[PDB]
Amino acid sequence: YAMNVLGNDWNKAYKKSARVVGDVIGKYHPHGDSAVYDTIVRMAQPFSLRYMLVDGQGNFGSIDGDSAAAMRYTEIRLAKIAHELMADLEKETVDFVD
């Protein structure tokens, strides 16, 4: 939802990971920021998800056991299939909470 609000579409330029993590932590998720980055990283690895939901640019780890680079080095944007999970969101099809 945060990436959708930021306007981080699948056919636009990439954005720094720190900006997205900062928005998520500062508006919606009241926890630490390192586990949020670890969660975001897993959604972009081709060997973890059958259909990836995040498109990444940089070093995101390997099947050999390597770790990803810190959040000051990478960039992300939404994947094309992730726009089908949020279709018709602005036509009052679901409920909202505080």
């Binding site: 070093n59 050999d64 680079a69 810190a70 080095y73």
Partner: peptide, 10 residues
């Protein structure tokens, strides 16, 4: 650096 080192190793 470490990030470029990992990228080069891969």
């Amino acid at each position: 650096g470490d990030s470029a080192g990992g990228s080069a190793k891969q």
